[PDB]
Design an enzyme around this catalytic site. Structure first.
Site, PDB file in Angstrom:
ATOM      1  N   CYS A 119      43.982  55.608  48.534  1.00 31.27           N
ATOM      2  CA  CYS A 119      42.629  55.037  48.558  1.00 31.27           C
ATOM      3  C   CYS A 119      41.661  56.146  48.285  1.00 31.27           C
ATOM      4  O   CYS A 119      41.772  57.287  48.793  1.00 31.27           O
ATOM      5  CB  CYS A 119      42.272  54.332  49.845  1.00 31.27           C
ATOM      6  SG  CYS A 119      42.007  55.431  51.245  1.00 31.27           S
ATOM      7  N   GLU A 148      39.126  49.362  48.200  1.00 32.07           N
ATOM      8  CA  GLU A 148      40.151  49.307  47.199  1.00 32.07           C
ATOM      9  C   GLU A 148      39.804  48.219  46.192  1.00 32.07           C
ATOM     10  O   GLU A 148      39.128  47.252  46.535  1.00 32.07           O
ATOM     11  CB  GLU A 148      41.522  49.045  47.817  1.00 32.07           C
ATOM     12  CG  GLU A 148      42.691  49.182  46.846  1.00 32.07           C
ATOM     13  CD  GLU A 148      42.683  50.535  46.099  1.00 32.07           C
ATOM     14  OE1 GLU A 148      43.307  51.493  46.606  1.00 32.07           O
ATOM     15  OE2 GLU A 148      42.026  50.655  45.021  1.00 32.07           O
TER      16      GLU A 148
END
EC number: 4.-.-.-
Length: 253
Positions: free
Chosen positions: A1, A126
């Site tokens: 991430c 995300e």
């Protein structure tokens, strides 16, 4: 991430990190380098975020279950880097796969020094790849929770590795970090195939931090996909890394 939110002011953040040491004594983590903390809803690689690390990294005779909170640079600058400036690194090293941490020098060495940290965030962002197009949908991903929501928010606690670097010709010691990644759980699998290594609760956090008592081999058993996570879609405001606003993480349909 590759993007997070960490916006809460210093004292709210600190309160959110209340813990007990090994003997059960209630404590709040002590800050180091606190002027490096700049709250934002939209943190990118090369920015600083607060992490937890064992107090034994700062005092030779500290109780290693005591916790420091220190802002560190996101993007690992290995101790052996030889150029004058971290901007001159070819790769940022913002994430590292759990299945490579014992194979790569950049991670294995700091782990040998016990440089295990817990990276804090409100949550992470995300972008979902969708079939038959190039546009990606952003999501904000966070622990399940209990204006009012920020009174008692449970911070996401991600497993990281940190290192210390000194400018070769002379300058201040830089602490920097990378977040360990694992496969996504079924709950997140429609969004992305990867997720951070999340340390879910006091035990997991304490063991990852306490390099004095928990070996590398034991600590790495804590690193795995986890299910205790939720998410919601957000607007395109977050897509631009220069936008720091509450709208970044606000839910949309």
């Amino acid at each position: 991430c590759g993007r997070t939110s960490c916006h809460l002011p210093r004292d709210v953040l600190t309160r959110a990190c209340a813990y007990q040491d090994r003997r059960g004594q209630q404590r709040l983590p002590e800050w180091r380098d606190p002027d490096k903390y700049c709250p934002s809803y939209n943190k990118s690689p090369q920015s600083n975020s607060p992490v937890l690390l064992s107090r034994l990294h700062f005092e030779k005779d500290a109780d290693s279950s005591e916790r420091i909170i220190a802002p560190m640079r996101w993007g690992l600058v290995p101790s052996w880097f030889k150029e004058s400036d971290p901007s001159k690194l070819q790769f940022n090293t913002t994430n590292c796969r759990s299945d490579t941490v014992m194979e790569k020098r950049s991670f294995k060495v700091p782990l040998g020094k016990g440089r295990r940290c817990v990276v804090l965030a409100d949550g992470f962002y995300e972008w979902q790849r969708c079939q038959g197009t190039n546009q990606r949908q952003p999501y904000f991903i966070y622990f399940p929770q209990i204006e009012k929501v920020w009174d008692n928010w449970r911070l996401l606690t991600m497993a990281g590795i940190f290192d210390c670097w000194e400018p070769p010709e002379g300058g201040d010691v830089l602490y920097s970090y990378t977040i360990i990644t694992v496969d996504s759980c079924k709950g997140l699998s429609d969004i992305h195939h990867r997720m951070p290594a999340i340390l879910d609760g006091e035990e997991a956090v304490s063991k990852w931090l306490d390099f004095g008592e928990v070996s590398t081999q034991e600590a790495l058993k804590l690193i795995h996909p986890t299910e205790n996570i939720t998410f919601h879609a957000v607007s395109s405001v977050v897509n631009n890394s220069r936008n720091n606003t509450p709208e970044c993480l606000a839910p949309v349909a």
